[PDB]
Amino acid sequence: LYYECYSDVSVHEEMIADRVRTDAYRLGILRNWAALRGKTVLDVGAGTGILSIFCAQAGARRVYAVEASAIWQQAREVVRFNGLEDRVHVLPGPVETVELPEQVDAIVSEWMGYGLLHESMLSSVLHARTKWLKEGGLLLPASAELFIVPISDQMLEWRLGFWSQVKQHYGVDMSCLEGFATRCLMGHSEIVVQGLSGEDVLARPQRFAQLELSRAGLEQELEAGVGGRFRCSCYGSAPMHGFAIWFQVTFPGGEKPLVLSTSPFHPATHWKQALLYLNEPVQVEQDTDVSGEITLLPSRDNPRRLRVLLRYKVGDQEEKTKDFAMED
Amino acid sequence: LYYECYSDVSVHEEMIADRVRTDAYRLGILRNWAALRGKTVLDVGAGTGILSIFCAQAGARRVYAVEASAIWQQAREVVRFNGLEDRVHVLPGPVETVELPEQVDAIVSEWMGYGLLHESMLSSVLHARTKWLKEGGLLLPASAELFIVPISDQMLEWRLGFWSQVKQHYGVDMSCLEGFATRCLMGHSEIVVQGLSGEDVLARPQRFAQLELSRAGLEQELEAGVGGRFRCSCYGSAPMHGFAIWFQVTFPGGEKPLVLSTSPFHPATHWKQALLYLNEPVQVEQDTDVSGEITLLPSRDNPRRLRVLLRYKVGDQEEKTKDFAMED
Numbered sequence A, B: 001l002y003y004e005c006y007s008d009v010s011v012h013e014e015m016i017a018d019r020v021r022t023d024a025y026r027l028g029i030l031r032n033w034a035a036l037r038g039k040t041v042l043d044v045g046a047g048t049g050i051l052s053i054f055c056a057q058a059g060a061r062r063v064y065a066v067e068a069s070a071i072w073q074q075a076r077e078v079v080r081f082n083g084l085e086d087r088v089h090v091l092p093g094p095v096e097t098v099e100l101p102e103q104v105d106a107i108v109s110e111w112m113g114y115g116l117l118h119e120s121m122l123s124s125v126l127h128a129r130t131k132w133l134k135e136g137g138l139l140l141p142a143s144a145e146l147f148i149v150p151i152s153d154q155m156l157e158w159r160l161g162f163w164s165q166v167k168q169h170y171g172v173d174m175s176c177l178e179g180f181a182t183r184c185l186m187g188h189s190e191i192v193v194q195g196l197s198g199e200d201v202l203a204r205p206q207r208f209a210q211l212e213l214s215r216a217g218l219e220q221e222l223e224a225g226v227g228g229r230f231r232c233s234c235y236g237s238a239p240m241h242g243f244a245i246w247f248q249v250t251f252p253g254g255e256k257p258l259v260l261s262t263s264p265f266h267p268a269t270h271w272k273q274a275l276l277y278l279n280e281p282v283q284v285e286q287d288t289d290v291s292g293e294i295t296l297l298p299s300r301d302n303p304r305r306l307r308v309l310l311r312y313k314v315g316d317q318e319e320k321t322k323d324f325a326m327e328d
């Protein structure tokens, strides 16, 4: 032990324990064997190196596994231990300053998530694409999509209703603290990462963004942000708590693309979903129109904030703005 | 909303959701009705005020509910809403500077837990006892005990063995990372608060400390720390990961005292147990002697550290020191 790495292994554990994430990258890379066999790959942020080894198993001649931080040591060890040190070169330090001997045929990466770490990871992948990817080279995954839907969070409803139950259980009335609990759990301006199920979803999810990660201009385009309008119609009576946002990414086939989805209707992943809570619950009914506009604006100046701008309208309520920010 | 209180309500929620904690204080206070009826109580750190209202229901004439932080507003509201503002006076600010009109017959408090917050809470209760409690006054709870036992953490064993499973699932060998995982999860010097079950316990738990909270000298005595020797004998074959520590507190009866226990053999509480991990697992067998000495030393100088000093011997292994610290 050099450094306290309790929080370290927990993140790498979470990723390898996620069978949806790991099978999607496994099957997604193997389905591209004809495009990878005898070719060169850059793995941007190789971590413990599993994506680099999947690329070798798919037939890559050379994999450059680039890892900025201390986990590079473990990637070095995993590669050696699988007898792949001739084929997979684990390189220390940031991809922005790495020197490869050649441009590569493919870039594999795992940048996706919510917050500044993932914003910077996407910027690092696009920097590597501009600098190192051959004309017409392959990106895995190739594209990303974002979805939004109105939600009723069953877990939040239990927590808000908890204070009304104290009188029955103990014989003291604490129902007067529902307002306090509501302001505390819903009244803030932070994104809450929490896993929902299908029955929390109040309407058809709407796609509001789609990024083709190979596009020449994408770095300059991201500067203006990602977003769109949405409109949907509620299924039934529910207390609406706000919106869920989630992503899917696509790996091209041999064939149909493989889709890695983080939707509440899909098997649970370590990514869960990003929840945007309204200041308080709003009752919806069958056919209640929910519309708005969502914009994600990149961080620019220190102290970095990724801004989430929401303007929305529930049924006959007036249009409302609620803006959120991520500061890690 | 004035302040982000997402982390706020989560702690008050955790406490009221804990039926073991809440029933112990409920039944513990009511069993003292004959000692409380027509008497005065100081509630040190009243929070949302439930312990102050339990004291009123037990027949207290006057309860001074003292709360240093912003949750005082909610305690004020809960008291008013239960029609007890004539009997329960919610006073803002630290107990060290509160002015009561009289010495009190009883002090109720909920100081127990692991870390500097709980060390300072115990110092605040003992300050209030010295300053405000009448000669022969009642403390609820009246005493505290600490226990230690060797443990095999089933959850830690799964996590350490996880890396050896990757080859079967995905077809890549990551067993070489068991050592890394072990150093990360066990090699640190922090106390881990985690809930165990009875089957994790490898021997008979040993009591190493007992505090009578009414004792005149206790404040000066705590300065030298709390601790003792222990000896026990393992039940069977297991990978020993370290020691668990937990507490119980006692509320005197009318009758036999009520004991609030946080033992792994007892119903789960929000306190869980405090785990002291060895640097790596040690195999024990039926009748393996485990002995040592545990000392808790108070924080003194900034930056505050509560020190946990452990010297122990497992079977025929040499005696070893592993010291821990809590810095929040």
Ligand SMILES: Cc1cc(C)cc([C@@H]2c3cc(C)ccc3NC(=O)CN2C(=O)c2ccc(Br)s2)c1
Pocket (backbone or CB within 6 Å): A111, A112, A113, A114, A115, A116, A118, A119, A122, A144, A145, A146, A191, A209, A211, A222, A225, A226, A245, A247, A274, A296, A297, A298, A306, A308, A326
């Ligand atoms: C997975 C994902 C896909 C896409 C298309 C974008 C984003 C999005 C993001 C946003 C910008 C402006 C730039 C880059 C960028 N990259 C990220 O990985 C970080 N990210 C996020 O933190 C958010 C997504 C949804 C919410 Br609510 S916050 C995340």
Ligand SMILES: Cc1cc(C)cc([C@@H]2c3cc(C)ccc3NC(=O)CN2C(=O)c2ccc(Br)s2)c1
Pocket (backbone or CB within 6 Å): B111, B112, B113, B114, B115, B116, B118, B119, B122, B144, B145, B146, B191, B209, B211, B222, B225, B226, B245, B247, B274, B296, B297, B298, B306, B308, B326
């Ligand atoms: C519940 C409990 C009971 C007793 C008798 C003590 C302690 C103990 C503690 C220790 C000192 C020196 C002074 C005060 C004091 N107070 C506390 O509430 C905080 N506390 C702790 O954080 C720890 C207990 C076990 C471990 Br491992 S750490 C905790």
Ligand SMILES: Nc1ncnc2c1ncn2[C@@H]1O[C@H](CSCC[C@H](N)C(=O)O)[C@@H](O)[C@H]1O
Pocket (backbone or CB within 6 Å): A012, A015, A044, A045, A046, A047, A048, A049, A050, A051, A066, A067, A068, A069, A071, A093, A094, A095, A096, A109, A110, A120, A121, A124
């Ligand atoms: N600019 C950069 N250059 C290189 N590595 C980077 C980087 N920014 C972040 N990273 C690394 O990217 C990794 C992403 S998480 C690890 C993912 C990896 N595919 C795996 O299977 O483990 C982290 O380990 C982080 O240290």
Ligand SMILES: Nc1ncnc2c1ncn2[C@@H]1O[C@H](CSCC[C@H](N)C(=O)O)[C@@H](O)[C@H]1O
Pocket (backbone or CB within 6 Å): B012, B015, B044, B045, B046, B047, B048, B049, B050, B051, B066, B067, B068, B069, B071, B093, B094, B095, B096, B109, B110, B120, B121, B124
């Ligand atoms: N020196 C001090 N004087 C007064 N209150 C204090 C204090 N130190 C801590 N506190 C308060 O003690 C409380 C302990 S947690 C709340 C426990 C309370 N019995 C309940 O049922 O809610 C916290 O709300 C904290 O703000």
